[PDB]
Design a protein around this ligand. Structure first.
Ligand SMILES: [K+]
Ligand SMILES: [K+]
Ligand SMILES: [Zn+2]
Lengths: 613, 385, 99, 209, 52, 30, 143
């Protein structure tokens, strides 16, 4: 083996993977016992049902009771194999607790202090003269009564990397404890051995040292010696030098002097890992917000969650309605859109995604860009020429029937989009992005004042060109978001740049890329679910008109329901154009489609119309 | 009466200087509470090492107090408990399982090899410091092995068996007619407040986090009984509090009580579980935000005792204690660490800083405002010394 | 610790018939001048080290490394500061020597 | 396989012994399914707090030690029952928040203990019904109900439940009843439960007409 | 034969161990000093005074 | 020969490191 | 089919190995609760995780961090944070020099041969030698 160097081998597989062959017999006996093929087939049905983690253990043993309870030794074999211990308990008394407050309640003054009962349980203290007897006092005692908190909040909880740091601290403290104890025991044993060396050969044979040896906290040495030999063969030695300290403690010392050397080298070899493991984990544990929110709204911006939000508002509205107090609810979700430039800003990113994406063919990419542009312009009622000019001037300074894009109510100020799930999902994705961007923009002026007022750290952004000039900070955020979406910037640089330059008040954009990836896939599935195509068609037919009667509103609801099944629900998105107030109602099928009655005769009209068809 | 204000950096007053007595015992660091237990005396040793390589011993007088005797420990505690403490041992625990439940020793406060040594070391450090503060030999007594403010007269709570702080205060009471206790641990100072509850010769002020939090005491209307009425002060804060907020809460109340209660000496508990990155606490103070409290009480000019306490992440509280020990000698230490032997504990940068996180702050101006105004409202009978 | 050397009736290269011994040199002897500049203290006239007992320690380290990476590939975890090792059969030798 | 005969006469003799304070009504409690219930009950939807739910907090407030053996008046509607029963939009039923049998922690939901006591909805199964103990912690009347469930299914009807607050138990066992396998707390390891314990003291029915 | 580089590996171990040993003793010396800082100054003063 | 390769972070501590032949031989020659 | 039998036996033997856990799931079994580290009380936090060991009466709320153990290839090993750290590749950290270039290329070995630490120690030493020589001089004239 001289010529070739040494290589680490792949791995040795665990033990509990390759030990099975003695039990493969029992199952043939079970097959013989059950006899029939179909009963055995449902037996294997429930076995696999369990092996896929679908039902519990006790319930499994009950289903196998339904089958092989007929045989006692077989059923006990099975019971002990799966380790189903007998729940031999029908006679169980829920017993009382021993502690909480068996004894103490009397005249109580203030929130958390009560008088001690006046009894001659007087335990006398020694060191007290008259002064200490008058200033120190023992009549009142403090006992917690966690009285309801008269409030409500959430409890702080540790970031994921703080815990890694705590565990590293504890590991190295334990190494240090063991090595320091081994050294101190080396010292004591060395003193003894030196006493033993210079003697006469008969005062040796009768030498005995009592337990403790001179260590006021003696147990340590025993502990040390245990850990050096073992806890099986260690008591034997701990006693063999309690009765022969002359011949069996130049051997217990020569070995502590090996274990000290070896355990310190081991501490060094693992401090290498401890050291490489701390640069990475330390700095990303001081950002609690940007690391909590990331996972929170990675796993909460899903279909189930927002549906559950609006339906929760619905259910507590209706059960408050069951209470006589409030009359009845009008709508559920409310949105205001004060600044409309942000709309184009979202497009600033929106198709900026698609120009990079590969999961789509460029023709249908043009098609869904058409979706976005025409849809925003028709819904929020801003001119398509405005988005035209914004697009053009954008790439200047940074230098058509919609049906086949996809393929009495007078004075119409309100317009209702009665939508199924996917439309609601895509729309509130849009709404989330818009409101978070408007929030990050409102204070952009004093943000410019922040970055300028900071007059001369992280030099990287300096050479990187990732600092913040006295430029428009909000437009710079737009630019950097584009940069990371197209990949001009890996993540952590975006992160710390925004963090220090703007403030830690801009964590809600640290995921912007991902959330845009949510609206370039849902809009694409808008044009591939034909039913939603029918929905959008009926919507634009109802919206492009300027006057219609409430009977045609009911008609619209009817044959928009036509395309979605009984199981599916509907949400009505009312948009009023004067203030861009967008409200959402959670509508169940047979009940009324639109605004509740103001007076009763409008819904006399409702009655006649809805029951007329 | 709460006014937001930024945090201007630490400035050492040269118009006041003092002679610092700093006690220590090179054995306190060999007693380990257990295997995974949070409390470590190793803490104290670490701080010493830093103080030894910053050359701070050229400005103060290191001592080594004499371990207190049982007849001093028996000024506050009871005889049965001190006996049990001297006898109990991990070797013979079962024979005691009666009194082991009367004195709370064994469930959360374990038994380890030589806990009586540690208890005596702490009590002795504190009593010697207070004695020398009574005898004019110094102006500041520093003891980082004391600060066990959770121990009861006849019970051991929160890893605190012996309540050496009450001993030190009874000592200071022989010479001075009024004392002021100031607790800046994240937990309520239940032991000292309970001990000194119905007297006026000591006034107690704690800055603790209230709610569903150990030990469950310290509510805004707990102000003492009978004679000591209005002579207790609790400041319940909430999560996330930071340097500017903590400072705007701390300085006005301390100034008000020093102007109205007229103390003769001050005791300061400097627990490090109110820093950022703790293991058992949820504040967000930084090194400078912590040290500011010590500085602002030092700038008043009276006899001061400075006792250690909580804090269960070793390197943070080590750095913070060394920094306050520097600024006690009217110095501001360089922000690099000298190569001591506990060096690798201080990665990855090896500096003298405790950095806060961007954790959310929950104390709103309305809360702190009504808290402080009703404190000031009830403090209008604390006027005559 | 140090670099294992080839001994008389010992470590591995003189047992298996592989190499010679180390033949320590005399205090004060012809030293090469380059060595006298790298400041010095020169023993062991010619290449003391024993190779086979370097190979064996390498194999032990490789086994430990493979155990760590296997813990990773099977339990999907990060190792936790390996345990400080006690003795193996030196306990049998200690007991046999005491008796 | 069996309904284990759980016993509460020890705990109840205990609380009659050492808490002989006269039974009083703390107040009225309006059930909610995403929040807690205050005894003055400011409007339910008042507070909405999100940290930018799936683990909504326990309904009952921390009542405190000084109020053992005092009963609380909880009101339940129909849609709440129907949502908990068939597991739609009810998080305190997906998480399965119930601990103990016949006496439960203050973290066990009132609806799941209602089900855990045999209270059913609709036409009751007219078979060999075992002795219903739907109010087990009422020493005299272990089944205290007033009125009847309406004969038409779909009725809007409500419930006035009286809950009784009891001292902490040593252990809380997992006992399966009526397809609700409760959760266990009090094992060889778990520290003792923090708050008090409770059980259904009384029930009355209400019809919306 | 091969070259497992044992010299450089032991050299790395040595150079890592060198600064840990020293600092314990340096702190011990610093601890000894802290007694002799109100004795050495006035001793040097009185010695130079008696000398001159 | 019992080489015992088992898990080891560290190496085994090496074995710690009369005969007047050539001296008296020099005296023979002299 | 006997493959269902094989996998059933495999799962039973693996869950009886003594490792791997028991996690608290949801009723549908798709919501796995988060770990209970940082909580002080336990009323309202029973579903999280190792929360079993958290009380509002014991000041030590750190028992949830005791580093689970696993038997493997002979002995018990501890784990830092299992899964449910590709940053640090320990098969690369933990190994010998393979050539001369590894004194600057390797990331751990370079942290040693470039330390400014053997040079500050010599400075402290000479700085104490100087003070002690001041003393030696002031004593050598009294005598
Ligand atoms: K405090
Ligand atoms: K007081
Ligand atoms: Zn504390």
């Amino acid at each position: 083996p001289s010529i070739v160097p040494v290589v680490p081998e792949p791995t040795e597989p665990i033990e509990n993977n390759i030990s099975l062959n003695e039990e493969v017999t029992f199952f043939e006996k079970a097959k013989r016992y059950i006899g029939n093929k179909h009963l055995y087939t449902e037996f294997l049905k429930i076995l696999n049902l369990y092996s896929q983690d679908i039902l519990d253990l006790d319930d499994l043993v009950e289903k196998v009771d339904f089958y092989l309870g007929s045989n006692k030794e077989l059923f006990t074999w099975f019971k002990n194999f799966v380790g189903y211990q007998e729940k031999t308990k029908c006679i169980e008394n829920i017993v009382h607790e021993k502690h909480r407050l068996d004894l103490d309640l009397c005249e109580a003054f203030g929130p958390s202090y009560k008088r001690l009962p006046k009894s001659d349980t007087f335990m006398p203290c020694s060191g007290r003269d008259d002064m200490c007897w008058e200033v120190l006092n023992d009549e009142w005692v403090g006992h917690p009564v966690w009285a309801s908190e008269d409030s409500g909040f959430i409890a702080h909880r540790k970031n994921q990397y703080e815990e890694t740091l705590f565990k590293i601290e504890e590991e190295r403290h334990e190494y240090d404890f063991y090595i320091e104890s081994n050294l101190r025991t080396i010292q004591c044993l060395e003193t003894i051995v030196n006493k033993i060396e210079n003697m006469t050969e008969n005062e040796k044979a009768n030498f005995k040292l009592p337990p403790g040896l001179g260590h006021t906290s003696m147990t340590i040495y025993k502990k040390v010696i245990r850990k050096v030999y073992d806890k099986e063969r260690g008591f034997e030695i701990i006693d063999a030098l309690h009765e022969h300290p002359a011949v069996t403690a130049p051997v217990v010392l020569k070995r502590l002097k090996q274990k000290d050397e070896e355990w310190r080298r081991a501490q060094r070899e693992w401090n290498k890992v401890w050291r490489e493991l701390e640069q990475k984990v330390f700095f990303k544990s001081l950002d609690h917000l940007g690391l909590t929110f990331k996972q929170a709204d990675k796993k909460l911006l899903t279909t189930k969650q927002l549906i559950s939000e609006i339906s929760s508002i619905k259910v507590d509205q209706t059960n408050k309605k069951i209470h006589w107090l409030t009359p009845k609810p009008k709508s559920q979700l409310d949105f205001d859109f004060p600044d409309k430039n942000i709309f184009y800003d979202i497009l600033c990113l929106a198709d900026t995604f698609i120009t990079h994406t590969t999961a789509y063919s460029n023709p249908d990419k043009e098609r869904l860009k058409d979706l976005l542009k025409y849809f925003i312009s028709l819904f929020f009622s801003i001119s398509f020429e405005k988005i035209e000019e914004s697009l053009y001037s954008h790439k200047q300074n940074v230098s058509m029937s919609l049906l086949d894009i996809l393929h009495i109510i007078q004075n119409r100020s309100i317009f209702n989009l009665f939508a199924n799930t996917n439309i609601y999902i895509f729309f509130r994705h849009w709404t989330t992005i818009y409101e978070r961007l408007l929030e990050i923009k409102q204070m952009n002026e004093r943000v410019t004042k922040e970055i300028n007022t900071r007059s001369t750290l992280s030099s990287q952004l300096s050479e990187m060109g990732l600092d913040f000039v006295g430029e428009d900070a909000y437009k710079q955020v737009l630019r950097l978001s584009r940069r990371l979406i197209n990949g001009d910037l890996e993540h952590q640089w975006f992160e710390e740049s925004l963090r220090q330059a703007y403030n830690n008040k801009a964590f809600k954009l640290y995921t912007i890329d991902k959330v845009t990836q949510s609206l370039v896939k849902h809009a694409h599935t808008l044009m591939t679910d034909a039913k939603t195509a029918e929905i959008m068609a009926l919507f634009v037919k109802d919206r492009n008109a300027s006057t219609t009667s409430a009977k045609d509103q009911i008609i619209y609801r009817l044959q928009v329901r036509s395309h979605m099944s009984n199981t599916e629900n509907m949400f009505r998105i009312e948009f009023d154009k004067r203030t861009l107030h967008v409200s959402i109602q959670y509508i169940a099928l047979d009940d009324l489609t639109l605004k509740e009655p103001k007076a009763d005769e409008d819904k006399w009209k409702y009655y006649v119309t809805s029951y007329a068809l | 009466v709460y006014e937001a204000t930024p945090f201007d950096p630490i400035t050492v007053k040269p118009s006041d200087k003092r002679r610092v007595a700093y006690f220590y015992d090179a054995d306190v660091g060999n007693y380990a509470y257990g295997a995974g237990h949070p409390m470590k005396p190793h803490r104290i040793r670490m701080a010493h090492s830093l103080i030894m390589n910053y050359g701070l011993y050229k400005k103060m007088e290191i001592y080594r107090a004499k371990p207190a005797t049982k007849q001093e420990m028996c000024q506050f505690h009871t005889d049965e408990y001190i006996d049990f403490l001297s006898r109990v041992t991990p070797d013979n625990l079962e024979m005691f399982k009666r009194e082991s439940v009367k004195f709370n020793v064994g469930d959360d406060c374990p038994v380890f090899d030589g806990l009586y040594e540690y208890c005596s070391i702490s009590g002795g450090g504190s009593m010697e410091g207070a004695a020398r503060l009574n005898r004019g030999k110094c102006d500041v007594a520093v003891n980082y092995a004391g600060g066990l403010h959770h121990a009861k007269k006849s019970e051991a709570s929160g890893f605190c068996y012996l309540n050496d702080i009450v001993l030190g205060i009874i000592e200071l009471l022989r010479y001075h007619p009024r004392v002021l206790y100031i607790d800046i641990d994240v937990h309520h100072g239940d032991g000292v407040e309970e001990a000194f509850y119905t007297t006026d010769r000591v006034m107690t002020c704690s800055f603790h986090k209230y709610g569903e939090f150990f030990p469950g005491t310290g509510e805004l209307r707990d102000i003492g009984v009978g004679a000591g009425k209005n002579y207790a002060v609790n400041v319940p804060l909430r999560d996330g509090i930071d340097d500017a907020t903590y400072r705007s809460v701390f300085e006005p109340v301390i100034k008000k009580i020093m102007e109205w209660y007229q103390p003769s000496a001050v005791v300061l508990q400097c627990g490090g579980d109110s820093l950022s990155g703790d293991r058992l606490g949820c504040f967000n103070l930084s090194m400078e935000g912590h040290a500011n409290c010590v500085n602002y009480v030092k700038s008043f000019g009276i006899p001061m005792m400075v006792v250690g306490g909580g804090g269960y992440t070793m390197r943070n509280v080590a750095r913070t204690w060394c920094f306050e020990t520097g600024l006690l000698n009217n110095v501001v230490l360089d922000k690099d660490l000298p190569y001591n032997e506990y060096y690798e504990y201080y990665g990855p940068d090896y500096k003298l800083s405790v950095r806060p996180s961007n954790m959310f702050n929950v104390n709103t101006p309305e809360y702190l405002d009504k808290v402080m105004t009703n404190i000031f409202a009830n403090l209008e009978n604390t006027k005559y010394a | 610790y140090h670099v294992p050397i080839k001994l008389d009736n010992k470590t591995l290269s003189c047992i298996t018939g592989y190499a010679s011994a180390a033949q320590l040199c005399y205090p004060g002897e012809p030293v090469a001048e380059d060595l006298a500049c790298e400041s010095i203290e020169y023993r062991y006239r010619a290449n003391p080290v024993d190779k086979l007992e370097v190979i064996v320690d390498r194999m032990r380290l490789n086994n430990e490394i493979s155990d760590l990476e296997g813990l990773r590939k099977y339990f999907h975890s990060f190792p936790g500061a390996p345990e400080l090792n006690p003795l193996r059969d030196s306990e049998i030798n200690d007991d046999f020597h005491q008796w | 396989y069996d309904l284990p005969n759980v016993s509460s006469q020890s705990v109840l003799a205990f609380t009659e012994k050492h808490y002989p304070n006269k039974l009083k009504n703390l107040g009225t409690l309006y059930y909610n399914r995403f929040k807690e219930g205050s005894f003055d009950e400011d409007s339910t939807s008042y507070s909405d707090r999100h940290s930018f739910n799936t683990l909504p907090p326990p309904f009952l407030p921390a009542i405190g030690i000084q109020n053992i053996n005092n009963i609380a008046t909880l009101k339940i509607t129909y849609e709440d029952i129907q949502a908990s029963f068939n597991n739609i939009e009810s998080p305190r039923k997906r998480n399965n928040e119930i601990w103990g049998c016949d006496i439960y922690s203050d973290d066990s939901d009132p609806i799941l203990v209602l089900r855990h006591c045999g209270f059913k909805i609709g036409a009751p199964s007219g078979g060999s019904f075992h002795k219903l103990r739907r109010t087990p912690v009422n020493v005299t009347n272990q089944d205290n109900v007033t009125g009847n469930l309406p004969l038409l299914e779909g009725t809007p009807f409500d419930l006035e439940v009286e809950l009784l607050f009891l001292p902490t138990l040593q252990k809380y066992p997992s006992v399966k009843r009526f397809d609700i396998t409760s959760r266990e707390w009090g094992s060889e390891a778990t520290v003792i439960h923090d708050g008090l314990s409770y059980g259904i003291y009384s029930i009355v029915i209400k019809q919306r007409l | 034969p091969a070259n497992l580089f044992p010299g450089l590996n032991d050299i790395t171990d040595v150079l890592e161990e060198f600064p840990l040993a020293t600092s314990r003793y340096l702190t011990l010396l610093h601890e000894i000093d802290a007694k002799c800082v109100h004795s050495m100054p006035n001793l040097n003063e009185r010695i130079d005074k008696f000398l001159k | 020969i019992p080489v015992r390769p088992e898990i080891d972070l560290d190496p085994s501590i090496v074995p710690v490191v009369i005969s007047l032949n050539e001296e008296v031989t020099f005296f023979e020659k002299a | 089919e006997s493959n269902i039998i094989s996998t059933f036996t495999r799962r039973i033997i693996k869950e009886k190995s003594g490792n791997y856990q028991v996690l608290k799931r949801s009723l549908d079994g798709k919501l796995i609760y988060p770990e209970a580290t940082g909580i002080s009380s336990n009323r309202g936090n029973k579903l999280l995780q190792r929360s079993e060991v958290v009380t509002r009466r014991d000041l030590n709320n750190s028992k949830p961090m005791i580093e689970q153990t696993v038997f493997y290839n002979g002995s018990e090993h501890r784990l830092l944070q299992t899964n449910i750290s590709k940053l640090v590749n320990v098969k690369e950290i933990l190994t010998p020099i393979l050539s001369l270039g590894d004194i600057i290329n390797h990331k751990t070995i370079s942290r040693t041969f470039s330390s400014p630490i053997l040079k500050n120690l010599a400075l402290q030493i000479i700085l104490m030698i100087e003070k002690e020589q001041m003393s030696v001089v002031r004593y050598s004239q009294f005598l």
